[PDB]
Curated annotation (Swiss-Prot):
Reactions catalysed: Hydrolysis of keratin, and of other proteins with subtilisin-like specificity. Hydrolyzes peptide amides
Protein name according to UniProt: Proteinase K
Cofactor annotation comment: Binds 2 calcium ions per subunit.
Gene: PROK
Species of provenance: Parengyodontium album (Tritirachium album)
Taxonomy of the source species: Eukaryota, Fungi, Dikarya, Ascomycota, Pezizomycotina
This protein's record includes keyword GTP-binding: no
Family per similarity comment: Belongs to the peptidase S8 family.
Amino acid sequence: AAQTNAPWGLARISSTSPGTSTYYYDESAGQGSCVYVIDTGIEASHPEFEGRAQMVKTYYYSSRDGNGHGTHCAGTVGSRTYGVAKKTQLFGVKVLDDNGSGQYSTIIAGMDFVASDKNNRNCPKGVVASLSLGGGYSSSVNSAAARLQSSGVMVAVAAGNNNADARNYSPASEPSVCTVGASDRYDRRSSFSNYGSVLDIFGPGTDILSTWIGGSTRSISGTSMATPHVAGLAAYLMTLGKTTAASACRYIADTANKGDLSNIPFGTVNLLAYNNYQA
Ligand SMILES: [Ca+2]
């Protein structure tokens, strides 16, 4: 399948070179996989989700996304126009308030919830969790992310936007999950992207067009935007049977475009997510 005039990030993950505008992908498109988006919520009624999104848990008064961030991330995972895995099932877990903030105890609870809730869902091709959030180092937050991964969920987390070593942020610094940095359309490390030896992979994160609340769209930047590209790619590859939740991060790194990025500091991987599609 091919999506013409796609957002640059989708085109980038199906090409060996920058500057293309077509997203090439297998028509299976993540069908039978499930992605939990642990964030500010999802506007499930947005037409771009085609009924494939639902809120399953909130830690606040409402389950609605009053911010936009979670809806944007969910759109990059699996919306029709802006998503990597256009047929995956999306589940929203609202651990962040509508200002985008949240206590670590609530974020931990949300991760433990996903590890249990997945046993109630029909996700024959596997389960992914996308965490476009983070703060200062916390061993308890890292442990919660490691638990979620150990339970059989592919966990993808944002490296952070401090132009610093991600070893000082959580859950970015947990080695057993998939820690995602950001690049821009010219194959530079995004100027805000954290770096360091704990990064596993880069994905598109500057000027990413996706869904927004009120049935709208908008373009924003962040490692929060790169993470759902990798989460969606994992769901896509699990549906194709190429990998499992336990090894998807390693498989993505092994099959990545290598050496293409600039402004990568010594000691950080130079690996860009790639779907290796061949018509
Ligand atoms: Ca890792």
